Amino acid sequence: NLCPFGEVFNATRFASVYAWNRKRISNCVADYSVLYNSASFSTFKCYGVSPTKLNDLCFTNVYADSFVIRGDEVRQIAPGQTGKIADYNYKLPDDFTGCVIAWNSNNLDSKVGGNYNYLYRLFRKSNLKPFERDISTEIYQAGSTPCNGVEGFNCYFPLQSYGFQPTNGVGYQPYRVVVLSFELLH
């Protein structure tokens, strides 16, 4: 049997980066050379492994994480990076072993009056641990006085929308990202 990579890359809709989707992949023969040779990928960067020398490699579990971010934020999906996304949405460990794949999806994830479907976390007290995932929606308290569920001054909703308009610069355009974390052995 074949690994369900079509369900990952060719999926109709991706998740928001703060609620990034993880799908485990095991008990399947996988064709990787087709992925690297595909010119339909703006970004295909592997860490700890040669991309070509991949079909001849066995790993226990392969986790595929997919979400949507801005073009300018793709550089944060990498080991040892800081920023809104890496700190508060999706963190990769310094010792990450795997590949990061991205492609422009302006034709899919942008609507004329803006696409407010995709969100990201703007406020969080502390950084995410590697592969941690936070989907809470509690009002972020920026001052001493508590918020008690009422937004306002010093009382900010933590999630913000991208509003992908098709006229945005590429750096503000939606890119779909797929992160393949491998479980390598001896």
Epitope: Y88, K125, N127, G143, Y156
Partner: antibody, heavy 117, light 110 residues
Framework: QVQLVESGGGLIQPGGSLRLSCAAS????????MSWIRQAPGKGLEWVSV???????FYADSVKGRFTISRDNSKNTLSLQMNSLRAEDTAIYYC???????????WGQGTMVTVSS | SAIQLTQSPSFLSASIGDRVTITCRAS??????LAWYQQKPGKAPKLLIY???TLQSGVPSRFSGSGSGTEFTLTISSLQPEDFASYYC??????????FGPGTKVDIKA
């Protein structure tokens, strides 16, 4: 009630160092995006540095490797360590809180940094 | 390949009651990611508008913003004596660093 108060500016020779402090009230520094923004006499606004609530810090290229931002959770304070100062660093320095993607709703009165010739 | 902001006009002088409009242009589409600030000389900037068209609390209603994408305007429907200042736009959610407009100075003559 809410305010930021800069301090520590002065007159310094080139290559000298200076350290600025921003005392907050009505607002918690380590829970906010806190940035330093400067304005050269007669010129425009130039963002300098920011520190995230999570602790990440970022700098403008013109100050990278010479300026260091920090905070004091104990005294609810923001600091800017300015080293190897140059004439183009002469400016009024403001600390401000970002509440939405760069929107600085709260500012301090500033503090004046002058780098003599 | 970074985004740059231009602000026009650079300087303008008007009279009390005048309707003043200031333009900010982005070199690439940035949706509604913009803020407007007023800076009187010797004072700290004051936030007027954020997200292109959201009026800051306490800011008089005669100030308003509009535009989305590349063209943004600030509008003072009826200029007041205290309204003389420079005015800055700012690219919000900007990478790698926040960008400020070059500023628009507003004077007041007879």
């Amino acid at each position: 009630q809410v305010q930021l108060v800069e301090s520590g500016g002065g007159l310094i020779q080139p290559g000298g160092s200076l350290r600025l402090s921003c005392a907050a009230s009505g607002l918690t520094v380590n829970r906010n995006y806190m940035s330093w923004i400067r304005q050269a006499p007669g010129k425009g606004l130039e963002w300098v540095s920011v520190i995230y609530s999570g602790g990440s810090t970022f700098y403008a290229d013109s100050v990278k490797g010479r300026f260091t931002i920090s905070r004091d959770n104990s005294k609810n304070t923001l600091s800017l360590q300015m080293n190897s100062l140059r004439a183009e660093d002469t400016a009024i320095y403001y600390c401000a809180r970002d509440f939405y993607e760069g929107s600085f709703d709260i500012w301090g009165q500033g503090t004046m940094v002058t780098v003599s010739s | 390949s970074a985004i740059q902001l231009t602000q026009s006009p650079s300087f303008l002088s008007a009279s009390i009651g005048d309707r003043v409009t200031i333009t900010c242009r982005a070199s690439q589409g940035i949706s509604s990611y913009l803020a407007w600030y007023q800076q009187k000389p010797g004072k700290a900037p004051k936030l007027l508008i954020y997200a292109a068209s959201t009026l800051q609390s306490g800011v008089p209603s005669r100030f308003s913003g509009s535009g989305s994408g590349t063209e943004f305007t600030l509008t003072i429907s009826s200029l007041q004596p205290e309204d003389f200042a420079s005015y800055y736009c700012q690219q919000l959610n900007s990478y790698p660093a926040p960008v400020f407009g070059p500023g628009t100075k507003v004077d007041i003559k007879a």
